[PDB]
Paper text:
Npro is a key effector protein of pestiviruses such as bovine viral diarrhea virus and abolishes host cell antiviral defense mechanisms. Detached Npro is proteolytically inactive but acts as a viral immediate effector to modulate the host cell’s antiviral defenses (Ruggli et al., 2003). The overall structure revealed two compacted folding units: a protease domain (orange) and an interaction domain (I-domain, green).
In order to compare this postcleavage, product-like Npro with a precleavage, substrate-like variant, we produced an [name] mutant Δ(2–21)Npro S169P6His, as proline in P1′ was shown to prevent autoproteolysis (Achmüller et al., 2007). To elucidate the detailed mechanism of the single autoproteolytic cleavage, we determined the structures of Δ(2–21)Npro and Δ(2–21)Npro S169P6His to 1.5 Å and 2.0 Å resolution, respectively. We provide mechanistic insight into the proteolytic assembly by describing a substrate-like, unprocessed P1′-site reaction intermediate. Here, a solvent molecule trapped at the active site offers a consistent reaction mechanism highlighting distinct roles of the catalytic water. Third, the positively charged side chains of Arg70 and Lys66 contribute to stabilize the hydroxide within the anion binding site. Several indications point to the existence of a hydroxide ion at the anion binding site. The geometric proximity of the activated water molecule to the scissile peptide bond suggests its relevance in catalysis. The substrate strand β4 with its P6–P1 residues is rigidly anchored to the edge strand β2 and His49 by a hydrogen bond network both before and after cleavage.
Numbering used by the authors: 21 to 170
Amino acid sequence: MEPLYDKNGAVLFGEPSDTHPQSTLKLPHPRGEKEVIVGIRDLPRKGDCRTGNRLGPVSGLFVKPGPVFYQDYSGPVYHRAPLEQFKQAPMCEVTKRIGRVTGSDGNLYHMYVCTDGCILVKTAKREGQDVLKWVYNVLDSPIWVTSCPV
Ligand SMILES: [Cl-]
Ligand SMILES: [O-]
C-alpha cells in the first residue's frame, strides 16, 4: 500500500517517494501545529498561510473521504493519492477544484470535489486519461493536497 508520512516528512512504512514537481504539494514543508477541520465553503484564503485565521494555523489543505477538509493536520498523511483505494468512475459535476496531487503511480492529477461529496482525480495528461473517485479509506488519513508557499 501507499505509505503515510509523519509531520517531519518521515515515511511511517514502505519506501518514500518524491511528489510531482507540478503538484500543489511542495516539500519539505512544516505542518502539525494543530489539527484544524474546515468546511468547504470556508477553505483557507490568501494571506492565511503567514498568519493563520480565526479557525487556527494553516499549513495548506488536506482532505479525506467524507469529505473532511483540514487547514492543518499533525497525524499521518498521504503525499500521493493512494490509487489502490480509488475506483475508475465517470466525471462528476464538480463543486470545487482543490489542487494538483501526485498519484501513487507518479503522475499528476487534478483533484476536485463533486456535488455528491466524492473526491475525484483526473489525469493531467492530454493522452491517457483516468478519472477516479476515492472510495476506500482503510487507514483513515487525508491527502496533503496543497502546501503553503514558503
Ligand atoms: Cl493504499
Ligand atoms: O495566503
